[PDB]
Amino acid sequence: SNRVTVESKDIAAFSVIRYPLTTDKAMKKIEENNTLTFIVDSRANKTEIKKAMRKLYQVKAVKVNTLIRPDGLKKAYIRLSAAHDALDTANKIGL
């Protein structure tokens, strides 16, 4: 190996999903749709935002739409499988 530095299961899932988003549009999409809005790290992956959700918020994710905002910050919309209410996570996650 060319390293010693320790790794875990945590840092692989807490670096991707960094904090949720609260806006007029990020709120209008939790209630109306079942999406959430997390400002994911920029070099993440739509398949790894799903894994991260399920590893952090034990909910399923169907469609994870992303976009690198004009701030270098990668937003992420996340449908919650229609079986996990989104309005029951923003109230859990404390959004």
Partner 1 sequence: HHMKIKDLREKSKDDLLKTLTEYKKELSQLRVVQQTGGAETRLGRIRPIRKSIARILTVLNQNERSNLKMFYADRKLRCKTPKVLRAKLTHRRRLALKENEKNRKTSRQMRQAHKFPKRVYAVK
Partner 2 sequence: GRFKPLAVKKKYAKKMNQNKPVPYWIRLRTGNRIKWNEKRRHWRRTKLNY
> Considering the rule CB under 7 A, would residue 84 count as an interface residue with RNA?
no
> Considering the rule CB under 8 A, would residue 58 count as an interface residue with partner 1?
no
Residue 67 touches which of partner 1, RNA, partner 2, none (CB < 5 to 8 A by kind)? RNA
- The residue count for binding RNA (CB under 7 A) is 46
Torsion on CA atoms 26, 63, 82, 11, rounded to nearest 10: -80
> Considering the rule CB under 7 A, would residue 41 count as an interface residue with RNA?
yes
CA 29 to CA 84: how far, in whole Å?
14
Cα(first)–Cα(last) distance of the chain, in Å?
A: 42
Residues in the site for partner 2, rule: CB under 8 A?
A: 68-73
